[PDB]
From a paper:
The human mitochondrial AAA+ protein LONP1 is a critical quality control protease involved in regulating diverse aspects of mitochondrial biology including proteostasis, electron transport chain activity, and mitochondrial transcription. The LONP1 protease consists of an N-terminal domain involved in substrate recognition and oligomerization, a AAA+ (ATPases associated with diverse cellular activities) domain that powers substrate translocation, and a C-terminal serine protease domain involved in substrate proteolysis. In mammals, LONP1 is a primary quality control protease responsible for regulating proteostasis and various biological functions within the mitochondrial matrix through diverse mechanisms. Here, we determine structures for human LONP1 in three different states: substrate-free, substrate-bound, and both substrate- and bortezomib-bound.
The substrate-bound LONP1 structure was resolved to ~3.2 Å resolution, which enabled atomic model building and refinement. Whereas the AAA+ ring of bacterial Lon consists of four descending ATPase domains in its spiral staircase with two ascending ‘seam’ subunits, our substrate-bound structure of human LONP1 contains five descending ATPase domain subunits with a single ‘seam’ subunit transitioning between the highest and lowest subunits. Accordingly, the four topmost subunits of the staircase are bound to ATPγS (hereafter referred to as ATP for simplicity) while the lowest subunit contains ADP in its nucleotide-binding site. Density corresponding to an ADP molecule is also observed in the ‘seam’, or transitional subunit. The ATPases in our human LONP1 reconstruction encircle a density accommodating a 12-residue peptide substrate (modeled as a polyalanine chain due to ambiguity of substrate sequence), which is surprisingly nearly twice the length of the engaged substrate visualized in substrate-bound Y. pestis Lon31. Notably, in addition to the pore loop 1 aromatic residue, we identified a second pore loop aromatic residue, Y599, within the AAA+ domains of human LONP1 that also engages the translocating substrate. This second pore loop residue assembles into a spiral that parallels the pore loop 1 aromatic, with Y599 from ATP1 and ATP2 engaged with the trapped substrate. Surprisingly, despite having a peptide substrate tightly bound within the channel, the protease domains of substrate-bound human LONP1 do not adopt a sixfold symmetric configuration. Instead, the protease domains of the substrate-bound hexamer follow the shallow spiraling trajectory of the AAA+ domains, with an opening in the proteolytic ring between ATP1 and ATP2, the two uppermost subunits of the spiral staircase. Further, we observe all six protease active sites to be in an inactive configuration, wherein a loop containing the catalytic serine residue (S855) is folded into a 310 helix, sterically occluding substrate access to the catalytic active site.
Numbering used by the authors:
A (entry chain C): 416 to 770
B (entry chain B): 420 to 770
């Protein structure tokens, strides 16, 4: 009956011994239970969860550094530290025999590609992707699940990740890990401590499955903004990698290669109707965008493009041409104008650098 | 029915009477009954947990010292505590149970020495971390009345180990939930009490279970967040950090070999010498624990492996001059303000 379905689910997987023992016990208990009862469907849902988890299924990982570097460099400009870390991860997974897992943390100012690089890394490694956002959450149940005794019990987001991704090689992104709750309603950072332990992660048990799951071959990537908020044992468990900002040159390269093309794709405009030269981009960056991230530059580019597109749909023009002389018309008054207050230093003044 | 389960045990009187009453109540009932299912599951659990059987724990001081020294390095007060445990278990002709607590900075080996202590004493090992746990159900269980009820973590541990006197390592005993939902600290205060271990009385089984032979170990990062009646029940043992020399011994004996195995390299492909390791520990890994030194070791071997695979080289050599482009900028500077002091300035050292 249903027991045959569960056995046929389990056949392809390579289950460990304790899991197979628990499954045998549960099938033996289900065999002698009347369908009209609620114990029956409690046990049936437990067997559902126990068999829907991929016990040995691993993704077919890409181990070609050429292809990995190509896919890694066709979606984000800089980030040499991150790209090198991923390439070394690949080289190690190849020099050893099998897949492996790590616990990384990307930290840096807002606007750099801390969140957007994870999906690219997943596509590069040909691993499965899953984004779990812990910003402000206080429910430890979202990490460890609830016991079976309760009515609407569920295993927790990590086990649901494994079930929904059908492999034990996912790239789990934990977004805004320094903004987690830590309140009267719960302190999920401690469960996160038990989850992201480089040595005990091999046997992590949530409270729904009383059996431990091997999360050692899972690529965990936490993204934080500041570090002093993360507690000391977490900071110890993770490998902090700094993703700094960008200088004007890198911002210009980003604008030319990704930001402006994507903004054009969104607004519908092409290079004929509205053209942004490299020189007006350099001027825009110099005069308006002096942050580490690129979100402000993205907003300024889309501002220029909306202003252009509004003249097209009405009768103001058929093509808009942006020059370093009429940039104030689009993005407004410049923000950064002059750097020196003294062109010739009098006897008593001296120019020093300051961070 | 299944009294052979008790034949392979030595059960006490009260649980025997409970099993007999429940077997009668099972006999006078019929199948297809909710009460039949409840009582059958109850007898299943009751006769599942072991009742008088112990593991034949090792009691050889030299063998235990060898197996304890093989795994870690220089946790001397912990190893002495375990050896004294064995000496007492020898002078008294029976098994023994204690309640220890290891507290110290992160990465010093508190959670890692427990499995080695279990290997030494030939006891069974259970971890059961409690970080962030909120509900008492995980310690004590639910009554038989509820559908889907089952005993707590301790009774499931007993059933799984199939023996009393296992070793239970309750992690993060200072990070237990004390918020709105539940307060399992009182359950732990009843469980880790040496005068009430002999009758534990979880909620599912109405019988009391003797837990006096279980060797409990609880790891904590700070004792401040442990309530005083609970600190007063544990033997607080401080696991302090390691100095540069102990860190070097750890790196040579454990860290670098394990990283070699995890990265697929050997000594001939990438050579980490004692002097470059000393320099790494001095300029980068200036902490109390070991995880950061392990991270640096993995970093060096990993960049080595990438250089080899990409075809750049076939054998990497990490020298105290070539270390910079492997681990980055040194977190601490070896050069001092004055290698030769002029008049007026004198070198003093502080704390
Ligand atoms: N080097 C880059 N190349 C191309 N696009 C980039 C680059 N850096 C950032 N971006 C783009 O800029 C935006 C950055 O957003 P992202 O979510 O990565 O920032 P974040 O660091 O996660 O911010 P927060 O601090 O809020 O988490 C994304 O749209 C991303 O596509
Ligand atoms: N003396 C030692 N010899 C060998 N390895 C050690 C030693 N001390 C620590 N380690 C290593 O440190 C790693 C992690 O240590 P562990 O996680 O047990 O520390 P911890 O006290 O649990 O930290 P936390 O308090 O943050 O949980 C282990 O893999 C262990 O091998
Ligand atoms: Mg983000
Ligand atoms: Mg620990």
């Amino acid at each position: 009956a249903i027991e045959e379905k569960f056995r046929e689910r389990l056949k392809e997987l390579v289950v460990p011994k304790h899991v197979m023992d628990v499954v045998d016990e549960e099938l033996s208990k289900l065999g002698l239970l009347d369908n009209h009862s609620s114990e029956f469907n409690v046990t049936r849902n437990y067997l559902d969860w126990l068999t829907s988890i991929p016990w040995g299924k691993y993704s077919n990982e890409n181990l070609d550094l050429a292809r990995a570097q190509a896919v890694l460099e066709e979606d984000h400009y800089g980030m040499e530290d991150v790209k090198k870390r991923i390439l070394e991860f690949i080289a190690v997974s190849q020099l050893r025999g099998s897949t492996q897992g790590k616990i990384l943390c990307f930290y840096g100012p807002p606007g750099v590609g801390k969140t957007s690089i994870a999906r690219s890394i997943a596509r590069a490694l040909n691993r499965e992707y899953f984004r779990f956002s812990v910003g402000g959450m206080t429910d430890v149940a979202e990490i460890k699940g609830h016991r079976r005794t309760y009515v609407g019990a569920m295993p927790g987001k990590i086990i649901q990740c494994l079930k929904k991704t059908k492999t034990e090689n996912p790239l789990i992104l934990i977004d805004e890990v320094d903004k987690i709750g830590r309140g009267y309603q719960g302190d999920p950072s401690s469960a996160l401590l038990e989850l992201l332990d480089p040595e005990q992660n091999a046997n992590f048990l949530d409270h729904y499955l009383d059996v431990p799951v091997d999360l050692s071959k899972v690529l965990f990537i936490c993204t934080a903004n500041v570090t002093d908020t993360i507690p000391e044992p977490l900071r110890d468990r993770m490998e902090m990698i700094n993703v700094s900002g960008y200088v004007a040159q890198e911002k210009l390269a980003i604008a030319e290669r990704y930001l402006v093309p994507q903004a054009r794709a969104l607004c519908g405009l092409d290079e004929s109707k509205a053209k942004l030269s490299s020189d007006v981009l350099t001027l825009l960056i110099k005069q308006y965008c002096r942050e580490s991230g690129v979100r402000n530059l993205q907003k300024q580019v889309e501002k220029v493009l909306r202003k252009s597109a509004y003249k097209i749909v009405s009768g103001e023009a058929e093509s808009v041409e942006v020059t370093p002389e009429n940039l104030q018309d689009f993005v407004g008054k410049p923000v950064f104008t002059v750097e020196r207050m003294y062109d010739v230093t009098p006897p008593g003044v001296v120019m020093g650098l300051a961070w």
